[PDB]
Symmetry: D2
Subunit: 267 residues, 4 copies
């Protein structure tokens, strides 16, 4: 197994279409022993994660809750056993209020909403690294989920800005993590039909936003030299596992694109 | 004059070493008629701006104050005369609490402080564009000040993250501004010895941060193929005026580097 | 005039739709005194350049001819007068044999053809700088024409590779030019309907290449927040003149995008 | 084994310090069955590769020899057996005549020398893909070696330009390879003390070039958040094997940085 004997924390599962659900499944297939973290709806998340190949302890983590973060390392150590540390951490957490994601004009998102989205989607990558680096082994790996924000796109709006901030945060987390012998990287995924994504395409944020997001997805498969299947998160999950493994040992502060190559082509 | 007959709003003057002070001076030398905006210490700012080549009306603008922003367009129109619109807007506004800029470890900045810095340094670029685009002429130009955040650097810490967000915001502001026939761009400047910058080098945020920032400045002149003079903001001001002029008419959503070429060389 | 009193060499005119024809026209409108260089069909080029606002001396320059390059500085000095130097140089020269530009598969271009295209389109930027820097004034400016090659695109094929090389060459030319107080930059233009470009769209290199290039142009105007008019080279010419002027004095080794902002947006 | 049962062609071994020697060793440790290609000194290369963990057939390949390239697929098939195809191809080939690499000024490299270096270091990536894609399995992987050329650096000179071209070539090879279900990527390595590299630092190309290259290496370990050991090619070899494996299945046309994270930090 690619991750045999590694202890890895995976955040971000909320449904069986969450990217983190597939990260967790593949990591377990590859021999990793997991600790899961979930936000708010913990009975739902437990029921969802009962479908994973192996049972995993589930800890509550609201990344906006300073007490959750202050206690997190102790609760993880309780879950994996004293004297054991983590080898990997997966941040698969993102949120932007509807006002920031195309339900209204870009200029009409109040800063209170934007700042909540940046807190959850970008600052919390540093928050989780601060909490967990003290219980991570040398040679460990922190991975977060990205959506390439180097160019503006319709509808994604302030979530794009949040991903721009996240990419910058990752480069600073790498500086801190390196003192522990730990790498920090993001995986920039192509679009994936999660429940939230499918709802947007179905018009949950208005018809214009849904039409714009559907056009975004279609251009992706067209541009990608190997194609892109938005209904299949497994290639993204495998890429996360590659970064969690020992096989990218000189990559840190960086971004790996699991997008079919779409960002390398113009059309 | 490069800007003859243009009406241009310039924010961001606080001392005679502010980058915006030199933007304002050069723009006036080039025939522009200015409206200035200032934050908090308006009697100080009036005294400072009395040294500009020409008298300019001074309006109060705290970019975190929604009432200041809601009234801004009406106060500008009162200053330049009914029936007149703006041709240019300069955003030269930046702030990050000391906790986010190296006085303590990167992980120790509370999010309340980071979010204040992102509000002032990044979100407010969209706020000012929202307020002023309705009173801007076609062919107009919005320019903001940037510091290249594509790579992490010591001490700048969360201000770097804020500039990453600002660059993303600029690309979305360009989408909105284009509907008015207006361009939006940033100028990424090399380091400039403002009063705040000199205080940091002198140790205002701790000795380690001061030493790191001094090393940053020295490498800049070394890398720049034409050199870099941190005591001279005039080349930065001229570049801002180039973007305010009609001579970069097909550039928008973009970043112009006024850094001596330092970002194009490794050593 | 933006370029009043400046002496500027402009290469690359072959028809009245050449980008260099419009660079020359705008520069002369702005007070510059020009020296033109032309390749191969010098009687045609003289007839074309008779339509410029002012008469300009025309010198022969085949950038693959080492004797043309060795004599160039002396012939320029003869044209502008002993004791006078150049303030600006415009490289607007590009060529790739048909085998490298979509008339056949990418893999079927022989290296002899690719190397000719790289010689003319990329190496010659260094060749011209080597020949002309000894007769350039401090504060001078060298500008070359670019087409953003950061992502692959259909049909452009090995010309894209040549532009990737040119961008790298420009960063090294900036190092050399800086010793003379001279800047070196490229302007990355959106697509322009030159005679050669119109012929390709009309099928001169095969129907597939023409269809692919037409689709490229259409996406450009769609993406550009201020639009893109492929029939109007004047915004590109003005941007070149901005770099030739004194108003971007701290930019070198760099690329300015005169593309309507299209490269900053995904869709 | 990460590469168990995969058939992989590895070019570029010339000494036991070649990056390709360590790629080959790690791939064999991970279960791959290799075919090696060597240039010019085939008895030397056979003696060198006798030290690999397993015997591998050695084929002659001068990438400037069209007959070598035309016969290559047939000779590989003869080596691995009819009915078998390749799963991986490693391009670890680079050369620039001394005139292009700092023994003289950048402007003094004749184009004949530059074009030879671009032929071997960039065009040949397309040449090898053209020859070998017809005998590659779906799900296969082509990997080439890169040195980040996004910024100019002293002494590397025209080799940097060649790497800029190679990166562009890789994006087009990905388009072609995708039709076969094959990925194409580069690994951008930090500096490695090969025999050629050590000779340059020792002054083989002049004292100035040696001093500049030594300063380049030292800044790399300083910038890298996890450090950089120029005497250890194993992290680079492991990264190549990661791209040859099935664990980066949605990455193509791309660049993976095995440089300690140095390119993500300014200082
Ligand atoms: N779906 C895509 O197209 C796509 C593409 C690239 C990247 N991503 C990124 O992948 C990550 C996972 O998103 P997803 O697509 O799987 O959607 P998802 O809705 O399945 O997962 C989002 C997760 O964020 C978590 N979260 C929200 N607020 C939280 C908080 N205060 N504390 C802790 N967790 C919180 C949710 O509980 C949920 O588990 C996100 O960073 C997303 O931006 C998604
Ligand atoms: N000094 C450098 O080295 C450098 C380099 C690149 C970019 N920049 C950028 O240039 C911009 C101007 O900064 P500066 O270097 O001239 O320093 P400065 O201290 O002279 O100017 C900062 C300005 O921000 C304004 N400001 C702060 N909070 C505000 C608020 N709530 N509302 C309105 N205005 C507010 C200050 O009043 C002040 O006028 C900033 O965006 C800065 O990040 C500076
Ligand atoms: N047309 C576009 O869409 C576009 C977009 C971006 C950049 N560009 C670039 O702008 C430059 C000018 O091209 P253009 O579009 O105006 O086409 P053009 O055909 O009008 O100009 C090409 C010029 O290259 C010159 N040239 C060719 N071989 C030469 C040689 N051996 N020595 C000297 N000169 C030689 C031609 O004589 C001709 O004057 C080129 O670098 C081109 O790549 C064009
Ligand atoms: N050493 C570094 O610091 C470093 C860093 C990043 C990338 N790289 C790249 O890694 C690759 C391998 O280089 P290396 O550092 O291991 O040095 P090396 O000298 O050990 O390998 C170079 C290889 O190129 C081959 N070669 C030269 N001409 C050839 C031809 N006409 N046909 C076929 N092969 C030919 C040589 O025979 C030799 O095997 C190169 O692309 C190099 O640019 C090296
Ligand atoms: O999850 C994401 O970051 C994401 C990425 C690409 C497209 C849409 C996205 N969604 C954001 C909310 C719901 N979907
Ligand atoms: O003004 C800036 O953004 C800035 C840019 C570069 C270096 C230091 C900076 N400072 C931030 C506060 C005081 N200086
Ligand atoms: O001139 C160019 O470089 C160019 C740029 C964009 C599209 C087509 C181009 N053409 C190349 C030959 C004829 N047109
Ligand atoms: O191999 C390379 O491409 C390389 C990369 C970085 C530094 C030096 C290099 N050398 C080139 C010739 C000898 N070394």
């Amino acid at each position: 197994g690619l991750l045999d004997g590694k202890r890895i924390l995976v955040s971000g599962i909320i449904t069986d279409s969450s990217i983190a659900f597939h990260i967790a499944r593949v990591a377990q297939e590859q021999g990793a022993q997991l600790v899961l973290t979930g936000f708010d709806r913990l009975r739902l998340i437990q029921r969802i994660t009962d479908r994973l190949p192996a049972k995993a302890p589930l800890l509550e983590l609201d990344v906006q809750n300073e007490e959750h973060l202050a206690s997190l390392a102790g609760r993880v150590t309780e879950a994996i056993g004293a004297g054991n540390k983590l080898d990997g951490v997966v941040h698969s957490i993102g949120f932007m209020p509807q006002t920031g994601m195309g339900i209204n004009p870009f200029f009409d998102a109040p800063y209170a909403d934007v700042s909540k989205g940046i807190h959850i989607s970008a600052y919390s990558y540093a928050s989780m690294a601060k909490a967990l680096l003290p219980i991570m082994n040398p040679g460990g790996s922190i991975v977060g989920m990205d959506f390439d924000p180097s160019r503006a796109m319709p509808a994604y709006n302030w979530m794009t800005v949040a991903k721009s901030a996240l990419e910058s945060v990752n480069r600073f987390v790498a500086r801190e993590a390196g003192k522990y012998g730990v790498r920090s990287n993001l995986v920039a995924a192509g679009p994936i039909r999660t429940l939230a994504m499918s709802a947007i395409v179905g018009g949950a944020l208005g018809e214009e936003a849904g039409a714009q997001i559907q056009l975004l997805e279609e251009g992706w498969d067209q541009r990608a030299p190997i194609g892109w299947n938005m209904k299949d998160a497994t290639p993204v999950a495998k890429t996360v596992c590659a970064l969690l493994s020992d096989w990218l040992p000189a990559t840190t502060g960086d971004i790996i694109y699991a997008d079919g190559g779409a960002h390398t082509q113009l059309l």
